[PDB]
């Protein structure tokens, strides 16, 4: 019993974190085999960020301008290249702790673990979701750039996020490990903002199934709805549309609890229209949307890595 | 910016998790140097749990009755002893991944990270607090016994909890690493139930200071309170008494934000009276009590927004 915001064990990722220094800037890098991946904005100065022609700034750098430190050991950079917004520093030592890994790009609504690092040293791990507006509600201070997000499947780490910036509302933006930003953001100093966000409906439903599995059933009712009526109500409350794919993905949770997905939608509609009336669900007074159906199945089944 | 329930990176603890099997029972063990620590109830049947005589059950066991598996390698048990409610299995191999560590017994209100494991394999990591009633609100399924709680301030792991059981309300009970239970709980199937729990006042105040540091002041008021008047009100909401020790511990957060502890107490009194009126504090509609003053200082910026 119990339901916590649970992150993947971070050991396989901790063994990849390094410190990258270029000029006065220090940030984090991800060392996999003989390459260290980091935000390309490490080549930038305070002025350079205003109009950064990253090809022009990079051509002026030599390999020895990049100082890479892994624990108490300096790695030597023997090559450098840029892939989208990530800088790839070729080093003369392959990381002996390189886990089995893949670079994956995730979709909004999908969750991942973040290993927040400072000066190449892991500080903490937390779970978060890629918001529908492509930001993440992270917890990051200055020096956290280059911290990565990941999931684990069996023995393979799927790296899905690298931290680049904090937006004016305090939320965060970054790229996949191929350096493609999530969302309409750029690594240049210009006016940027998080767009209006929405609630991840399929995740709220997954969390309501988690509450039922844990014995919290007060919100259940005899009613069902159709997908179209539910989506008309979801649009009204800034909830993401629920698709037949979401209904299919919630199938196993529906079979386990005996509550059809549209039956749970009628519960969600009533919660949106009437509130919780002084009650909580899984210790929360708000509808939680940062657990996917897979996270719920995994936490209520004890999957290991 | 941001404020998340952040766990310590779990790598140093992952490298210590092993599987312990005795008869048909399989649970987790913590392998540090040449000793594997695990709940002594690994030697019990379900019928033994009503009134187990651990000394009598243990004397009947030989070293080779304990099967210890670390990854795909069987460790050989060369000795065994019981210390309170923990069994210490001496093995013929020292764990090469043993981190710098200490065994620490914590007090109610203290937080720690839990690395939930099954079959000696880590499944996830989350943050927990030792409740005032000495239980933890964990997320644990059958087979999670022997999973540990810890803190990693610096590069030293302070192990503070070993999981033993789930109580009837779905909350959890366990011991320190010397095998002393937290609370009045016993590793015996008795009618023991979690006592009435209370809110960890000093932690709620720390979290209100975190909210001020992150840029929110809506909940502040022009009032102050004496410590005694605050405690008289707080106890009416099932909040723990706030002691002069708690006031002293909140000193640094008070100095950073410019809000006197007793002025923050006045704000908490008003939040208890009024509720949040549709507002949130650090993304929560409830007053959060699982961040200590130390956690807030660790996670938050040293410069108030
Ligand atoms: C060089 O990093 C910057 C940054 O956002 N860093 C941060 C990232 N996370 C948490 C932060 C907490 C507080 C302070 C900065 C944080 C500084 C501000 O200007 C910019 C501008 C751009 Cl386009 C980019 Cl890609 C990065 C940065
Ligand atoms: C042998 O472990 C037990 C247990 O609590 N296990 C569990 C621990 N965590 C989460 C659980 C989730 C669901 C089912 C069991 C869980 C089984 C029940 O009876 C008892 C009774 C006692 Cl006095 C003790 Cl010390 C252990 C156990
Ligand atoms: Cl303590």
Question: Could you tell me the two tokens for A231?
Answer: 């989506």
The residue with tokens 């995740």 is A203
On the CB side of A201, how many CA atoms lie within 13 Å of its CA? Answer: 29
Which residues have C-beta within 8 Å of that of residue B288, sequence separation ≥ 6? B203, B204, B207, B281, B282
A302 within 8 A of B144, measured Cβ to Cβ: yes
Chain B hits for A302, CB-CB cut-off 8 Å, are 116, 118, 123, 141, 143-144
Contact in structure between A136 and A111 (CB atoms under 8 Å): no
DSSP 8-state secondary structure symbol assigned to residue A42: G
Q: For B285, list phi and psi in degrees, rounded to 5.
A: -95, 0
In chain B, the DSSP E strands lie at: 17-22, 25-32, 35-39, 66-70, 73-75, 77-83, 86-91, 100-103, 111-118, 121-129, 148-151, 156-166, 172-175
**Catalytic, out of B16, B22, B38, B41:** B41
Here the tokens at position B149 are 């709680």
Cα–Cα distance between B295 and A47 in angstroms, integer? 35
Same domain? For B83 and B5 the reply is no
Sheet holding A77-83, edge to edge: A73-75, A66-70, A17-22, A25-32, A35-39, A86-91, A77-83
Name the domain boundary from B177, B197, B217: B197
Contact (CB, 8 A) for A79 and A63: yes
For A91, the token pair is 């080093």
Residue A246 is among the residues annotated as catalytic for this protein: no
**Sign of the dihedral defined by the CA atoms of residues B201, B203, B208, B212, in that order:** positive
Contact call for residues B134 and B185 (beta carbons, < 8 A)? yes
Q: Give yes or no for a contact between A139 and B4, defined as CB atoms under 8 angstroms apart.
A: yes
Same domain for A104 and A180: yes
Residues A57 and A6 in one domain: no
* Chain A residues whose beta carbon lies within 8 Å of the beta carbon of residue B140: 1-2
Burial of A84 (0-12, 13-18, 19+ CB in 10 A): middle
Nearest to A171 by CA among A137, A131, A132: A137
Domain co-membership, B288 together with B210 = yes
Paired with B281 in beta bridges are B284
Please state, in angstroms and rounded to a whole number, the distance separating the CA atoms of residues A117 and A28: 7
Cβ neighbours for A127, distance < 8 A, ≥ 6 positions apart:
A5, A6, A7, A111, A112, A113, A114, A290
> How many Cβ atoms sit within 10 Å of the Cβ of residue B271?
19
**Which strand (E) or helix (H) includes residue B228?**
helix B227-236
Q: In the numeric block, which tokens belong to residue A25?
A: 């800037």
Assess contact for B80 and B89: CB atoms under 8 A.
Answer: yes
Task: Select the residue from B5, B8, B9 to test the A interface by mutation, using most A Cβ atoms within 10 A.
Answer: B9
Q: How far apart are CA B114 and CA B127, in angstroms?
A: 6
Cβ-contact A115, A10 below 8 angstroms: yes
**For ligand 2, mutation pick of B47, B117, B140, B166 (most atoms within 8 Å of CB):** B166
Residues 6+ apart with CB under 8 A from A292: A109, A110, A111, A129, A202, A203, A206
Question: Rounded to whole angstroms, how far apart are CA atoms B111 and A283?
Answer: 17
d(CA A247, CA A13): 33
Q: For residues A229 and B109, give the distance between their C-alpha atoms in angstroms, rounded to a whole number.
A: 46
In this complex, the residue of A7, A11, A137 whose CB is nearest that of residue B11 is A11
A145 is catalytic: yes
Residues A217 and A287 in one domain: yes
Among B153, B267, B146, which Cα is nearest to B201's? Answer: B267
CATH number at residue A274: 1.10.1840.10
Are residue B242 and residue B132 in the same domain, yes or no?
A: no
Place of tokens 């908490």: B268
Query: B234 and B300 in contact (C-beta within 8 Å)?
Result: no
State which H helix or E strand residue A230 sits in.
helix A227-236
Nearest to A208 by CA among A144, A134, A267: A267
How far is Cα B227 from Cα A138, in angstroms, rounded to an integer? 35
Chain centre to alpha carbon of residue B43: 25
Instruction: Write out the DSSP string of A47-75.
Output: TTTTS--HHHHHHT--GGGEEEEETTEEE
Q: Is B40 in the pocket of ligand 2 (CB under 6 A)?
A: no
Residue A278 and residue A237 in one domain: yes
Beta bridge partners of A163: A174
3-state secondary structure string, A275-302?
Answer: CCCCCCECCECCCCCCCCHHHHHHHCCC
Whether the Cβ atoms of residue A143 and residue A52 lie closer than 8 Å to each other: no
∠ CA B216-B222-B224, rounded to 5°: 105
Residues A125 and A249 in one domain: no
CA distance B14 to chain A (A): 7
Among candidate residues B197, B213, B245, the one where a domain is terminated: B197
Neighbouring C-alpha atoms within 13 Å toward the C-beta of A118 = 10
Q: CA–CA separation, B139 vs B171, rounded Å?
A: 8
DSSP state of A33: T
- Residue in chain B closest to A288 (alpha carbons) equals B284
Cα B109 from Cα B111, distance rounded (Å):
6
How crowded is the C-beta side of B113, counted as CA atoms within 13 Å? Answer: 30
How many other CB atoms are found less than 10 A from the CB of residue A153? 13
**Residue A50 Cα to ligand 1 middle (Å):** 13
Instruction: Count the Cβ atoms, other than its own, within 10 Å of residue B126.
Output: 24
Looking at the structure, tell me whether residues A176 and A280 fall in a common domain. no
3 state SS of A260: coil
Query: Closest Cα to residue A28, out of A192, A112, A140, A136?
Result: A140
- Domain of A28, CATH number, reads 2.40.10.10
The counts of H helices and E strands in chain B are 8, 13
Using CB atoms, pick whichever of B122, B125, B301 lies closest to residue A141: B301
Measured CA to CA, the distance from residue A206 to residue A137 in angstroms comes to 20
Measured in angstroms, the CA of A55 and the nearest CA of chain B are apart by 31
- Measure the CA–CA gap between A132 and B283, rounded to whole angstroms: 17
- Chain A nearest-CA residue for B154: A123
Q: Which residues surround ligand 3, an ion (CB under 5 A)?
A: B 106-107, 110
Contact (CB, 8 A) for B116 and A6? yes
Indicate if A2 and A71 belong to the same structural domain. Answer: no
A193 and A128: one domain?
Answer: yes
Q: Are B28 and B20 in contact (CB under 8 A)?
A: yes
Cα dihedral B162/B164/B165/B171 (nearest 10): -10
Widest distance between CA atoms in chain B:
69
Chain B partners of A170 at a C-beta cutoff of 8 Å?
1-2, 214-215
> From residue A55, how far is each of A45, A84, A87, A172, B253 by CA, in Å?
14, 11, 11, 25, 45
Pocket-testing residue among B25, B117, B142, ligand 2, by greatest number of atoms within 8 A of Cβ: B142
Domain span holding position B84: 15-99
Reported structure resolution in angstroms: 1.6
With a 6 A CB cut-off, is B105 part of the ligand 2 pocket?
Answer: no
- Say whether both B83 and B30 belong to one domain: yes
List % helix, strand, coil for chain A (3-state, nearest 5): 25, 30, 45
Beta strands A17-22 and A66-70: pairing type? antiparallel
Cβ neighbours for B33, distance < 8 A, ≥ 6 positions apart:
B94, B95, B98
Could you say which of B53, B77, B99 is where a domain stops? B99
Count of structural domains within chain A: 3
Q: What angle do CA A136, A278, A217 make, to 5 degrees?
A: 80
Under an 8 A CB cutoff, do A140 and B2 touch? yes
d(CA A90, CA A67): 12
- Bridge-based pairing of strands B77-83 and B25-32 is unpaired
The token duo for A136 is: 């993440």
CB A202 within 8 A of CB A292: yes
User: CA B139, CA B150: separation in Å to the nearest integer?
Assistant: 15
B15 vs chain A: nearest CA distance in angstroms? Answer: 8
Would you state the structure tokens that stand for residue B152, as one six-digit string? 């990693």
For residue B296, the chain A residue with the least C-alpha distance is A139
Query: What kind of experiment solved this structure?
Result: X-ray
């Amino acid at each position: 019993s119990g339901f916590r915001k649970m992150a993947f064990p971070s050991g396989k990722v901790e063994g990849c974190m390094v410190q990258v220094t270029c000029g006065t800037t220090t940030l984090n890098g991800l060392w996999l085999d003989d390459v260290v991946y980091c935000p390309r904005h490490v080549i930038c100065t305070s002025e350079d960020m205003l109009n950064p022609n990253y090809e022009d700034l990079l051509i002026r750098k030599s390999n020895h301008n990049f100082l890479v430190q892994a624990g108490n050991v300096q790695l030597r950079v023997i090559g450098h290249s840029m892939q989208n917004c990530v800088l790839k520093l070729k080093v003369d030592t392959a990381n002996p702790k390189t886990p089995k890994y893949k670079f994956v790009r995730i979709q909004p609504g999908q969750t991942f673990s973040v290993l927040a690092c400072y000066n190449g040293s892991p500080s903490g791990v937390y779970q978060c979701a890629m918001r529908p507006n492509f930001t993440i509600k992270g917890s990051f201070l200055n020096g956290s750039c280059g911290s990565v997000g990941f999931n684990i499947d069996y023995d393979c780490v799927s790296f899905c996020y690298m931290h680049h910036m904090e937006l004016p509302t305090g939320v965060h933006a970054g790229t996949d490990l191929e350096g493609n930003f999530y969302g309409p953001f750029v690594d240049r100093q210009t006016a940027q903002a998080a767009g209006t966000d929405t609630t991840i409906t399929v995740n709220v439903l997954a969390w309501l199934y988690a509450a039922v599995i844990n014995g919290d059933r007060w919100f259940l009712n005899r009613f069902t709805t159709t997908l179209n009526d539910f989506n008309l109500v979801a649009m009204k409350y800034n909830y993401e549309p629920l698709t037949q794919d979401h209904v299919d993905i919630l199938g196993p949770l529906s079979a386990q609890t005996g509550i059809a997905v549209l039956d749970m939608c009628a519960s969600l509609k009533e919660l949106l229209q009437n509130g919780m009336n002084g009650r909580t669900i899984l210790g929360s007074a708000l509808l939680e949307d940062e657990f996917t159906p897979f996270d719920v199945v995994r936490q209520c089944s004890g999957v290991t890595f």
